């Protein structure tokens, strides 16, 4: 009874979760309409947390896929994952709604589809014996995932008050603003809701995805459909200490609690090294334990856009370093001995810090039971560089006199412009103030 309903919502957010669900069948090694293997209980030692708790003798996904675009739910059946999803909770065969592109359009459409959105996730969290929480797999990009998603962070936060809240935030591309210009308004609107009706975030910059897609994959030009590959991997990578053995704080409310020093200091930088084609053929011949988990303490894999002078003028407070598959686990403390001799990572000395290392035995699948994958879940205090990026683009646009009565056409009829500047400046001083 550690059941999570993931709320894949938004146009880009459904796609990062689509290929997330196609990965879990591949590592439990089952045909997606049954358990057809015995590796289902021996290899993966959990049978529920992203599955419905049995009463039929089957394991159905605990998934909701809500969008206002039917293009995402019609792309279910262009693949054989339309006999894994069932049409009454996980989708609704044809569902319309607004274009919508404006945040304040979808935010009031949350308030009249209030009956179905709070009775669609409770007609599937009515087999659970105590809910772990809701992970809002929703995009910050577009006005569909962002409009409805800033609403649900308020209402699952007043009827489920001890529930774990956690988002997979994915931003809109910031280096194209020749096709969009509403981009600093709709982004910062969600971020205000993230620093007081939410507890944890995961911040994923899109230009810092595409940094890696040209530095590890080597495509001619990154575009939506080549961006679902880096995001979907880090999702199935975060539940490799919740589905596979650990021992202590291997529940989801153990790891995620220890990466939050305090509300408004929870912005987690993510790194994921294995996408390259000549580092994928170095694990067949085994690479050393003394270099595959010190490379998760080397900053060159970050999915947050920052400077390289702020990774040395700022220090880690909570860092998680997940090695997968091969590990050789009797030199994992030898690897931890050597952090002090190279000094690649710097650590707080004003107060306690934690370098959490974990290893887990995964189920059979050649990309992960023979291949070393390293997932980083940092908490580094140069996240204020993103908050400068969104405030410096917000104030520049309101002086060109745009979105001051052209964003107020739906549900906004009050002043709230300096309310968004002041809360961002609160966050940027209270992080920096928490560590000397």
């Amino acid at each position: 009874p550690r059941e999570i309903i993931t709320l894949q919502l938004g146009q880009c957010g459904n796609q990062i979760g689509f290929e997330f669900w196609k990965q879990l069948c591949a590592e439990h090694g089952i045909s997606p309409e049954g358990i057809v293997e015995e590796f289902a209980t021996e290899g993966t030692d959990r049978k529920d947390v992203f599955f419905y708790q049995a009463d039929d003798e089957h394991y159905i996904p605990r998934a909701v896929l809500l969008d206002l675009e039917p293009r995402v739910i019609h792309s279910i059946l262009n693949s054989p994952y339309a006999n894994l999803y069932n049409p009454e909770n996980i989708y609704l065969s044809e569902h319309g709604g607004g274009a919508g592109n404006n945040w304040a359009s979808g935010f009031s459409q949350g308030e009249k589809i209030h009956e179905d959105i709070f009775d669609i996730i409770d007609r599937e969290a009515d087999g659970s014996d105590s809910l772990e929480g809701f992970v809002l797999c929703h995009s910050i990009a577009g006005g569909t995932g962002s409009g409805l998603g800033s609403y649900l962070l308020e209402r699952l936060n007043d009827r489920y008050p001890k529930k774990l809240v956690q988002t997979y935030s994915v931003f809109p591309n910031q280096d194209e603003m020749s096709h969009v210009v509403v981009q600093p308004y709709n982004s910062l609107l969600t971020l205000k809701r993230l620093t007081q009706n939410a507890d944890c975030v995961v911040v994923l910059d899109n230009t810092a995805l595409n940094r890696i897609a040209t530095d590890r994959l080597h495509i001619q030009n990154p575009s939506f459909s080549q961006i679902n590959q880096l995001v979907s991997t880090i999702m199935s990578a975060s539940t490799t200490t919740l589905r596979y053995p650990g021992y202590m704080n291997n529940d989801l409310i153990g790891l995620i609690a220890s990466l939050i020093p305090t509300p408004r200091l929870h912005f987690l930088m993510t790194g994921y090294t294995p996408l390259t084609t000549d580092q994928s053929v170095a694990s067949v011949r085994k690479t050393t334990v003394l270099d595959v988990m010190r490379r998760l303490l080397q900053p060159k894999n970050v999915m947050v856009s920052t400077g390289r002078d702020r990774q040395t003028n700022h220090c880690y407070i909570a860092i998680l370093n997940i090695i997968q598959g091969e590990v050789d686990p009797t030199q994992v403390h030898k690897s931890l001995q050597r952090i002090r001799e190279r000094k690649l990572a710097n650590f707080i000395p004003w107060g306690p810090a934690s370098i959490q290392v974990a290893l887990s035995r995964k189920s059979p699948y050649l990309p992960s039971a023979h291949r070393v994958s390293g997932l980083m879940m940092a908490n580094h205090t140069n996240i204020s560089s993103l908050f400068e990026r969104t405030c410096r683009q917000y104030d520049k646009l309101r002086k060109r006199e745009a979105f001051l009565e052209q964003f107020r056409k739906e549900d906004i009829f009050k002043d709230n412009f300096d309310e968004l500047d002041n809360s961002r400046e609160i966050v940027q001083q209270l992080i920096d103030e928490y560590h000397a």
């Binding site: 001995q337 050597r338 001799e341």
Partner: protein
């Protein structure tokens, strides 16, 4: 050969970095926790140059001795008070005796002090890197005759050790392995290995542990502290420091001449190279 004679010289190189955490003593922590955190980083110092892994560097262990280097307050050192201790264990101790361990601590300790001279002389070469932490390449406010007395210093040390390195390595490695092995019937090795060890320290320097050659290596060390402390930071005090060095080298020349007998220690032949140098000007 690799960890006492330093033919894996990458270890003695890593030692130079550990010796860059020293610069004399005391000023370093004194705890019973001081060997506990220091025996680890020395075993790791072979990996610190990225060579091998611990499983042929666990034959070597270190026992840190405590001695007063504040000269009544205890503060320990890694010049002559850091000692390699070879293991006694069931596979090799047909070669291992406690007498032969006494001289493993002596060779490892004899190398380490002369190496701290050579290292700290190159701390001076980083000081004076030019554009413009050098200040001055010649007179006035002196560099010309300063550096003239500096170069005849680093002549003498680099060419003394050079002669000492060649009697240390070549006959000892031919004497040992080949001979012992070839003579086959192997029994009671530790009476032969110690005779080997007794020829090996004859080749090192020996000095009969009493003779003014031992007084000149003590005394040229006492000026070497005045050379690093003045250059890190007095020009009349510079030139006095090497006038005492010139006293000590001219004292050495008269000692070579009363050691000259007809053939008497392999250092003697190599010393008469330098004697005929002295004759040439």
């Amino acid at each position: 050969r690799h960890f006492l004679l330093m033919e894996d010289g990458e270890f003695a190189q890593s030692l130079s970095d550990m010796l860059f955490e020293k610069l004399g003593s005391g000023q370093t922590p004194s705890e019973l926790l001081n060997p506990l955190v220091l025996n680890s980083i020395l075993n790791k110092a072979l990996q610190y140059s990225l060579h091998g892994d611990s499983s042929l560097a666990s034959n070597l262990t270190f026992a840190l001795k405590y001695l007063p280097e504040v000269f009544t307050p205890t503060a320990p050192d890694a010049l002559s008070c850091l000692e390699l201790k070879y293991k006694v264990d069931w596979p090799l101790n047909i070669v291992i005796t406690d007498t032969c361990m006494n001289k493993y601590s002596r060779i490892f300790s004899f190398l380490l002090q002369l190496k701290h001279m050579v290292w700290t002389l190159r701390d001076v070469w980083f000081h004076l890197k030019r554009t413009a932490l050098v200040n001055q390449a010649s007179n006035s406010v002196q560099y010309r005759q300063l550096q003239l007395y500096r170069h005849e210093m680093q002549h003498f040390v680099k060419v003394i050790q050079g002669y000492i390195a060649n009697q240390i390595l070549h006959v000892t490695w031919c004497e040992f392995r080949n001979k012992l092995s070839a003579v086959s019937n192997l029994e009671e090795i530790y009476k032969t290995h110690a005779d080997y060890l007794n020829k090996a320290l004859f080749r090192g320097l020996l000095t009969e542990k009493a003779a003014p050659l031992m007084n000149i290596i003590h005394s040229i060390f006492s000026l070497i502290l005045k050379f690093r402390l003045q250059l890190i930071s007095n020009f009349g005090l510079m030139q006095q420091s090497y006038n005492t060095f010139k006293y000590y080298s001219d004292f050495l020349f008269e000692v070579v001449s009363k050691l000259v007998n007809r053939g008497y220690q392999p250092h003697l032949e190599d010393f008469l190279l330098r004697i005929n140098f002295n004759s040439y000007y």
